[PDB]
């Protein structure tokens, strides 16, 4: 299929079968119930690609073979009407960066672009033109798609745009009626005290302004960059105020300035690390090695709420890809190394499962549900953390949603416009926490992706587009460049943000003390239509500013070719405070500006406000009982199990996660912090935790901020940090601000964590952000609406870990014991806007908060002498749900029974089972109960611990009173309701009959949990012979651009005795490197061109259509004695590479998983007989492994080649269930794989390739569970040492 197009020429390729069969079956059930007689469908991918030149035959196979990909599904013959989507002309997906990068790095040069749509082909003879219109309603997202009657319609995807010319406003021959008009026209959103300024400063210079320098303008002056509520004079109640928000925020860093290396002064704070071994391979040699050093530590939290409300998927995952740029663009630059995560949304309602609590009470036309919002955004999130490779270790998530008696009386309040949180830790280098100076003459360069129109001005708009390998490229280039320690070129970064390059290149010379001079037309453009408006002001994503001297220009051009990472040299720092944005192709000048006059300020805002207080109702109990209670809270989505949040996301890249969410043998996500290790060879580390309470501030604003900075303390509280200054906290401040009842509000809250609370625990904010419009207004109906969010502050808790081998967890042991409550609360018990409440459409009279700060302090500090002491065996803080909650949590993370006395704790057994005050429940040994209570006592506890009981085998929860029995169930009944909305949503996301395997193995009690039998002696350093010789052969550690694991992978191999070599595929194709002088290769994990066009595939196909580099892959595999391990992505690249390794006829192909979805999970393996010589004397071994693959589900042509597969002996590893069974069960085999096959090897054994990852789990530390008695080595270790020794 081949037509001209434009002075281009477009080609049609078919594609493959499009969706599985479970997915067409929903689609034909949604049909039939919105009465449309749809008979059948069937969905085929159809490829475009815009060539600037033609193709000969051996390039058009080329491009046929890059352009098969994906799961071998039946195709069917068109039938039916034919309904193309597409993306909207004028943008271009990210699968289509991806996949034209692949082309051209397949010597394809002809294709000037690919663009992927789905054909649906739908039976329904009998439809009417309205009805066809419904049904291409039902196959398209409207935000981003369309839906085209021909295929020779994508023609319309590739037009070309002559430039736009920048527009002048007419003030001179208008007057002020100009400015008004471009305010109302460009949506500049102004004051009236704005145009005044601009008015004047126009008058001044005597020349109209242009449109750019208005939109510019108006983006740094938004309330979203400026802050201006975050710095403004406040009066309360007739009173003026001493102190702007920020300024109370400040207080905390002139209280505790200790471990603080950065505050205030970039897009991330920096406190102190620990000196140990970073590890990166020398600009030199190549070779990875330990720098011995200070790694200190960035944290940053950021939303982006509005946009997720309109487009959930890339609202979540730019909010995290936005995120990650303010880390690596800390400093003079940084490397990200773990995630969070957040999310507030209004009630599911999922269909149902409908709980009691919920109403329906509409929603505006313009946004998504909050269902939508949590089934695609945390896929957003995920597929960029995924992507990118950072781990996401910890997270909230809270649903709200309720007609509530608050501080404005009767009204919504909840989370149509939700919270999209997302955040992380770093690591940074001593002497790059300080931002350089910008010599003048310092080139200015944009690192990162060309710009298309996104963000300018249904809400497209609101739009946004992530490509998360463009910025993994980036911050390889990034880390190349902290990486040459004092030779770092790199003067100044900053993110690419809001504003875009208007805001980021004018910040950027202004933070340096200078002007600019910019060129257009030097900036990368996908779009040649777009105004220098558009260019200058798009927020495009995955790019970064910044400033190099000249003569470092070609070391700096060097580092990005390398990556493969694109750049440009847009202009030059000047002496002169002047901002100049010249265009070569008009011939003029789009900005010409004195910095002060665009820098320049309005004045500052008064915000004259009132106090309301709402008056708490007690709680109405006629409906209540406690065992109703129990059920009803544990399905609450706030309380319930996470897992639908949490392996979906990586928690093993790096190597150095410690500990995640899942915990324990039977892997149950309750872990109340995340720690990573600072290193792959120390054991201090790095912690994080979250706290937030909004629901509290209905009825409290202060209650609820100090009740977030307690629940991050009391989450973090069992790691092993020491001096309480050493936390140091992110606060996130979300608001409806200009609600009644609001601002007041936020100053009080503000007021009692700023100069009160945080001051005197000794905790320090350094960083922190504002999103102040949380509120929604539609029409619904003949009436208006609003749904407000409650002010909702939420804390995220980072600290610098003393040992990470030290941290507790929910896990119960069932050793002889007792449970220990730390009741925070000192017995006040409160139920006011509880999860108790909540789920009985109630709000209640008083809630809970910090009741005595001395005891939190005294708390924090009696559990960090425990844990360095050794004395606990568990802990669980108490949250949303309570007690009740904590304790059931334990049981499910310990897979046992409790036997509890609550008599101590009030009358009120609802009450003391169900407040959410502060405090928690630790597990100590039986013979250490007293020596533990006599510490407690000594930091002022004694009345606040109560002794509860004990954990004890079986499957009984059991509370009682005395001699009465409170509450007493089945622990696997309350598990498995504690995972139905997990369960739910797996089951309307993922494939159902994996979301249902899932959840039913939850019912099996007699699940003995993940556990270990070992063939070997896993502490027998076979390499140690070796490596004693001095002797280290080499090992070519090989990445493509958007691999991401290839440190881990190095340090492994480096344990064992190799010198781990950096090959780049730019290496090989450059000649830098050539495999003839290695006995040994490795292909690392991650996601190579994003995945796009199969994973693993562009990698493989490079490397086959490119003749010389090809050749060297063949010679180096026909070898006699050459060793080579594909891990993951490569395993995928190295299966796609079978013609050229000897004994790989009967291999298979790597696909989607059967879930449909991303599997990060520990997954328990068997290793199974076969040649392979890197699992030599593990045969027989039993042993968990980190999973983390969407594509990883072994497929064979038939079932001919799995048998003559199997006969032949090949398979390696084999997914197993924890009754040590072969499975095909999921998620004990997590990605559907036949006979459980996990690995294949070579017929000679010298080739293995397989989905796990030994390298994120060597270490036993790093991993998320293991047994006890374990070494610094975990039984994955062996691999590296087999390899060692097979070379001698
Ligand atoms: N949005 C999310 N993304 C990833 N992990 C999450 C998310 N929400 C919760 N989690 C994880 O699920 C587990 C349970 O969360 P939750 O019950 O909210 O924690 P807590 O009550 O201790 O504050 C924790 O390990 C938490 O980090
Ligand atoms: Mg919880
Ligand atoms: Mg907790
Ligand atoms: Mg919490």
Redesign the pocket.
């Known amino acids: 299929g081949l037509v001209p197009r434009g002075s281009h020429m477009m080609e049609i390729l078919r594609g493959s079968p499009a969706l599985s069969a479970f997915r067409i079956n929903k689609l034909l059930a949604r049909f039939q119930a919105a009465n449309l007689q749809v008979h059948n469908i069937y969905a085929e991918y159809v490829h475009f690609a815009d060539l600037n030149a033609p193709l000969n035959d051996s390039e058009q196979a080329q491009l046929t073979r890059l352009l098969q990909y994906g799961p071998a599904l039946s195709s069917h013959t068109p039938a039916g009407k034919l309904l193309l989507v597409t993306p909207r002309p004028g943008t271009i997906s990210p699968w289509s960066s991806k996949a034209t990068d692949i082309a051209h790095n397949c010597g394809l040069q002809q294709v000037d672009r690919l663009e992927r749509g789905v054909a649906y082909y739908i039976e329904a003879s009998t439809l009417t033109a309205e009805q066809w219109r419904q049904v291409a309603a039902e196959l398209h997202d409207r935000m981003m798609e369309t839906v085209f009657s021909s295929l020779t319609d994508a023609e319309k995807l590739f037009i070309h745009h002559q430039p736009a010319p920048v527009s002048s406003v007419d003030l001179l021959g208008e007057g002020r009626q100009a400015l008004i008009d471009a305010n109302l026209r460009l949506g500049l959103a102004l004051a009236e005290d704005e145009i005044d300024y601009l008015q004047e400063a126009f008058t001044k210079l005597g020349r109209n302004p242009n449109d750019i320098e208005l939109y510019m303008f108006a983006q740094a002056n938004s309330e979203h960059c400026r802050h201006k509520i975050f710095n403004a004079d406040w009066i309360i109640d007739g009173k003026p105020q001493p102190k702007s928000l920020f300024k109370m925020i400040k207080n905390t860093f002139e209280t505790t300035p200790d471990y603080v290396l950065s505050a205030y002064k970039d897009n991330a704070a920096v406190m102190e690390g620990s000196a140990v071994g970073r590890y990166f391979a020398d600009h030199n040699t190549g070779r990875y090695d330990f720098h011995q050093e200070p790694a200190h530590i960035l944290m940053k939290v950021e939303t982006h709420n509005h946009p997720t409300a309109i487009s959930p998927w890339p609202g979540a995952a730019t909010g995290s890809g936005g995120e990650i740029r303010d880390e690596g663009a800390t400093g003079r630059g940084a490397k990200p190394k773990a995630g969070?995560?957040?999310?507030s949304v209004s009630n599911l309602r999922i269909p149902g499962f409908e709980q009691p609590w919920e109403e329906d009470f509409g929603k505006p036309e313009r946004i998504v549900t909050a269902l939508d919002i949590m089934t695609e955004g945390?896929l957003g999130?995920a597929a960029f953390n995924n992507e990118f490779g950072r781990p996401?270790?910890?997270?909230?998530?809270?649903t709200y949603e309720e007609k509530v008696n608050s501080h404005n009386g009767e009204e919504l309040r909840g989370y149509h416009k939700p919270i999209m949180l997302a955040g992380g830790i770093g690591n940074i280098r001593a002497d790059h926490v300080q931002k350089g100076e910008i010599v003048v003459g310092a080139k200015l360069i944009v690192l990162g992706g060309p710009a298309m129109n996104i963000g300018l001005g249904l809400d497209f708009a609101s739009v946004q587009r992530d490509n998360p390998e463009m910025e993994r490229r980036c911050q390889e280039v990034i880390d190349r460049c902290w990486q040459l320690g004092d030779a770092n070129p790199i003067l100044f970064i900053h993110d690419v943000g809001a504003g875009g390059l208007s805001n980021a290149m004018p910040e950027l010379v202004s933070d340096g003390g200078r002007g600019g001079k910019f060129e257009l037309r030097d900036i990368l453009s996908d779009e040649p239509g777009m105004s220098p408006l558009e260019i200058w002001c798009n927020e495009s994503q995955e790019r970064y500013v910044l400033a190099v001297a000249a003569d470092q220009l070609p070391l700096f051009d060097e580092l990005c070719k390398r990556e493969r990472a694109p750049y440009a040299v847009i202009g030059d720092a000047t002496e002169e405070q002047h901002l100049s944005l010249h265009d070569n192709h008009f011939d003029n000048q789009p900005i010409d500006l004195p910095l002060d006059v665009l820098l320049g300020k309005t004045p500052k805002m008064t915000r004259d406000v009132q106090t309301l207080k709402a008056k708490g109702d007690a709680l109405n109990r006629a409906d209540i009982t406690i065992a109703d209670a129990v059920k009803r809270v544990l399905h609450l989505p706030?309380?319930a199990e996470?897992t639908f949040?949490?392996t979906i996301?990586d928690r093993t890249v790096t190597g150095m996660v410690a500990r995640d969410?899942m915990v324990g043998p039977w892997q149950v996500?309750?872990?109340?912090?995340?720690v990573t290790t600072a290193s792959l060879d120390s054991y201090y580390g790095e912690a994080m935790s979250?706290?937030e309470r909004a629901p509290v501030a209905l009825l409290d604003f202060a209650a609820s901020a100090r009740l977030a900075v307690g629940?991050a303390l009391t989450?973090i509280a069992a790691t092993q940090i020491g001096d309480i200054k050493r936390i140091k906290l992110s606060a996130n401040w979300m608001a409806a601000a200009g609600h009644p009842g609001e601002d007041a509000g936020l100053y009080d809250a503000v007021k009692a964590v700023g100069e009160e609370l945080c001051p005197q625990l000794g905790l320090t904010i350094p960083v922190g952000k504002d999103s102040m419009s949380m509120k929604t207004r539609w029409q619904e109906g003949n009436e208006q609406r609003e749904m407000t969010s409650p002010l909702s502050l939420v804390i995220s808790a980072f600290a610098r870990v003393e040992d990470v081998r030290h941290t507790l967890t929910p896990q119960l042991s069932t050793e002889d014991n007792a449970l220990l409550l730390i009741d925070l609360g000192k017995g006040h018990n409160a139920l006011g806007a509880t999860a108790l409440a909540q789920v009985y459409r109630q709000l209640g009279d008083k809630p809970a908060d910090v009741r005595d700060v001395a005891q939190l302090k005294g708390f924090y500090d009696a559990m960090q002498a425990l844990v360095a002491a050794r004395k606990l065996l568990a802990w669980?803080?108490r949250?949303?749900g309570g007690l009740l909650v904590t304790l059931a949590?334990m049981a499910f993370a310990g897979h046992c029974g409790v036997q509890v006395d609550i008599a101590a704790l009030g009358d009120d057994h609802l009450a003391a089972l169900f407040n959410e005050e502060l405090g928690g429940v630790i597990q100590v040994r039986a013979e250490d109960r007293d020596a533990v209570e006599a510490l407690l006592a000594q930091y002022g506890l004694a009345d606040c611990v109560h002794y509860l009981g004990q954990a004890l085998a079986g499957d009984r929860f059991v509370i009682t009173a005395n001699d009465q029995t409170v509450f007493s169930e089945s622990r696997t009944t309350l598990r498995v309701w504690w995972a139905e909305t997990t369960w739910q949503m797996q089951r309307l996301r993922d494939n159902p009959q994996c979301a249902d395997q899932e959840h039913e193995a939850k019912a099996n009690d007699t699940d003995p949990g993940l556990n270990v039998k070992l063939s070997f002696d896993i502490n027998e350093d076979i390499a140690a012979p070796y490596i004693a010789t001095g002797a280290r052969p080499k090992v070519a550690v090989l990445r493509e651009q958007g691999v991401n694991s290839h440190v881990e992978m190095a340090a492994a191999f480096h344990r064992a005795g190799f010198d781990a070599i950096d090959v780049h595929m730019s290496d090989l194709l450059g000649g830098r490197i050539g495999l003839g002088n290695f006995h040994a290769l490795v292909a690392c994990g991650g996601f190579s061109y994003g995945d796009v066009l199969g994973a693993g595939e562009g990698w493989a196909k490079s490397i086959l259509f490119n003749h010389r580099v090809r050749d060297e892959f063949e010679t180096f595999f026909h070898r006699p004695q050459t060793l080579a391990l594909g891990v993951c992505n490569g395993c995928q690249m190295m299966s796609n590479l079978r013609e050229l390794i000897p004994g790989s006829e009967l291999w298979p192909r790597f696909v989607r998983n059967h879930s449909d979805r991303f599997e990060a999970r520990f997954s328990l393996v068997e290793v199974t007989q076969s040649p392979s010589l890197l699992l030599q004397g593990m045969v027989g071994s039993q042993m968990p492994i980190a999973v983390s693959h969407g594509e990883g589900r072994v497929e064979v042509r038939d079932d001919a080649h799995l048998a003559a597969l199997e006969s032949k002996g090949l398979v390696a590893l084999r997914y197993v269930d924890n009754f040590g069974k072969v499975t095909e069960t999921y998620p004990a085999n997590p990605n559907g794989s036949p006979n459980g096959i996990t690995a294949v090897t070579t017929e000679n054994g010298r080739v293995t390739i397989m989905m796990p990852h030994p390298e994120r789990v060597f270490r036993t530390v790093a991993n998320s569970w293991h047994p006890e008695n374990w070494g610094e080595d975990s039984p994955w270790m062996r691999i590296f040492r087999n390899a060692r020794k097979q070379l001698g």
């Open positions: 969070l995560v957040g999310f945390p999130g996401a270790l910890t997270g909230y998530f809270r706030t309380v996470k949040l949490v996301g969410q996500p309750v872990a109340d912090c995340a979250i706290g629940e989450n669980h803080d949250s949303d949590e």
